[PDB]
Design a protein around this ligand. Structure first.
Ligand SMILES: CCCCCCCCCCO[C@@H]1O[C@H](CO)[C@@H](O[C@H]2O[C@H](CO)[C@@H](O)[C@H](O)[C@H]2O)[C@H](O)[C@H]1O
Length: 494
């Protein structure tokens, strides 16, 4: 009846004021959440944003990472204080049909992330081991056994294995930046919140600064990682009776989370400056993982004689594919954990880790093998580009499930009927939190129409355009009705 019953309140190791050892003990949760923010679903957009705007968009990465740290810390607070996850709070404060809608929506979100991870991992196999594209996918389906071995390890090592992956993809991209020797003064200048990123005038590669910036801001948080953080934050036992101990517990998980999401922000920065310093100006014509592989393996695409010799040897691209693998491993852990959370929290369905990863991975690979089937039926022509368009079109479910995850979080944590007059949010985070939630909800409701129209490809059928307008209006209005309904129920609780 409590979230993550297998590992809930497992190891509590606060020892007086021995803080940093106490930090070492529970540092696990934050990395599990952050590694999701390094998935290859936006690797191209950081490199593309770098080529189109050298170092300019680095500040937007910082701001987005700050907002994500805010909402993530809020979810961790709900888990720590209330000893229950975000799904259990929402489901307890609304009916079952709303918990079911939220369930299917978040299932679709983690499914979209899973589609990104299976595409990137399968392509990683096609690049590293030269496995055929159709075989690499059905090889990625075998991660259920890696989950069986994953199940016996334990969170003191699982949450450290996630750290291992994090520093794998962090050192892979940092290594190609170390060889690049970039002008770190222009990087510093880029990290400062300037107003050139909010303008619309450069328009390089069909992208204005305001468009790229508003995209980075719009894709700030992942809805499933909120429920994830609120569930994993409970894995540390707390007496819930000593205010200094729970205040300490909140400091604990906060410093953890920021320590990890800061690493994710560093990875995004390494991707942008990877697009600025490593690649030549405009060398990336194919945002696909294969396009970045050949672009990282062509000496004329780099901007340094050392990167040309290393690229000719063939180490820059292989490291890239390794990073693709390490990123593709994340949805196997966090997808199963979060899927359990939203399942047994929203619809009260107790399912094992066996059938969970099976169903999610199958539903994820069905459109992948359909796409590979059609493109290989066209002669393996534009097969990687179509996989990239599938990966990008999948991310609409995140925009569908985002408001119903950030709005109830902010409400339930801002009410004293859930946190109490002692641990509710400061007036400082009330303003920043509501500002962030409003901005993200508006931006994603804007993204709905763009992605729904993007389903019909770059070929704008005049009759299908109006249909995309009707469907978009219907979807955003339906999300408005669901949103005001949820607002009404939660505010009835408070
Ligand atoms: C597209 C146009 C964009 C315009 C952007 C303008 C930004 C306005 C910021 C408003 O700030 C919040 O608005 C909530 C609504 O009025 C207030 O009530 C809130 O009060 C509690 C939080 O303190 C919550 O628990 C409640 O659910 C909620 O009603 C809340 O006090 C306040 O901080």
């Amino acid at each position: 009846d409590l979230s993550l019953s297998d590992i809930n309140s497992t190891v509590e190791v606060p020892e007086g004021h021995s803080f940093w050892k106490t930090l070492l003990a529970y540092s696990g949760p934050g990395a599990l959440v952050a590694v999701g923010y390094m998935d290859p679903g936006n690797w191209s957009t950081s490199i593309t944003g770098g080529q189109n705007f050298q170092y300019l968009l680095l500040s937007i990465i910082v701001i987005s990472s700050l907002l994500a740290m805010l909402l993530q810390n809020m979810a961790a607070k709900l888990g720590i204080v209330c000893q229950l996850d975000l799904a259990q709070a929402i489901r307890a404060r609304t009916s079952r049909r709303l918990g079911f809608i939220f369930w299917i929506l978040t299932e679709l979100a983690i499914m979209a992330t899973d589609i990104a991870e299976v595409i990137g991992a399968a392509i990683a196999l096609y690049l590293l081991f030269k496995i055929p594209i159709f075989l690499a996918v059905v090889i990625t389906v075998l991660d259920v056994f890696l989950l069986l071995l994953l199940n016996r390890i334990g969170f003191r090592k699982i949450e450290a294995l996630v750290v291992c992956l994090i520093f794998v993809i962090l050192f892979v991209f940092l290594y190609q930046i170390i060889l690049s020797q970039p002008a770190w003064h222009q990087v510093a200048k880029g990290l400062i919140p300037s107003w050139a990123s909010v303008q619309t005038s450069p328009k390089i590669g069909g992208q204005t600064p305001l468009s790229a910036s508003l995209g980075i801001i719009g894709a700030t948080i992942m809805p499933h990682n909120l429920f994830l953080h609120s569930a994993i934050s409970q894995s540390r036992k707390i007496d819930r009776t000593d205010s200094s101990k729970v205040a300490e517990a909140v400091r604990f998980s906060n410093w953890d989370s920021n320590i990890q999401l800061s690493l994710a922000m560093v990875v995004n920065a390494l991707l942008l400056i990877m697009g600025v310093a490593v690649f030549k100006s405009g060398a990336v014509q194919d945002p696909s993982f294969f396009g970045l592989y050949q672009a990282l393996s062509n000496p004329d695409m780099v901007s340094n004689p050392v990167l040309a010799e290393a690229a000719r040897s063939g180490v820059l691209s292989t490291l890239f594919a390794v990073a693709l693998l390490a990123s593709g491993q994340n949805s196997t852990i966090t997808g199963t954990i979060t899927g359990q959370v939203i399942m047994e929290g929203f619809i009260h369905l107790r399912l094992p880790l066996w059938l969970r990863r099976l169903v999610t991975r199958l539903i994820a690979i069905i459109p992948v093998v359909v796409c590979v089937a059609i493109t290989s039926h066209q002669g393996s022509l534009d097969e990687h580009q179509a996989l990239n368009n599938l990966m990008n079109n999948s991310q609409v479910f995140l925009a569908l499930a985002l408001p119903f995850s950030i709005v109830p979080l902010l409400m339930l944590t801002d009410s004293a009927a859930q946190m109490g007059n002692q641990f509710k949010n400061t007036r400082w985070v009330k303003v920043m939190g509501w500002l962030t939630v409003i901005i993200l909800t508006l931006l994603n409701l804007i993204s709905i129409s763009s992605q729904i129209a993007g389903f019909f490809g770059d070929n704008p059928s005049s009759q299908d355009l109006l249909l995309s307008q009707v469907i978009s209006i219907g979807i955003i209005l339906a999300m408005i009705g669901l949103l005001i309904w949820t607002i009404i129920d939660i505010r009835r609780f408070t």
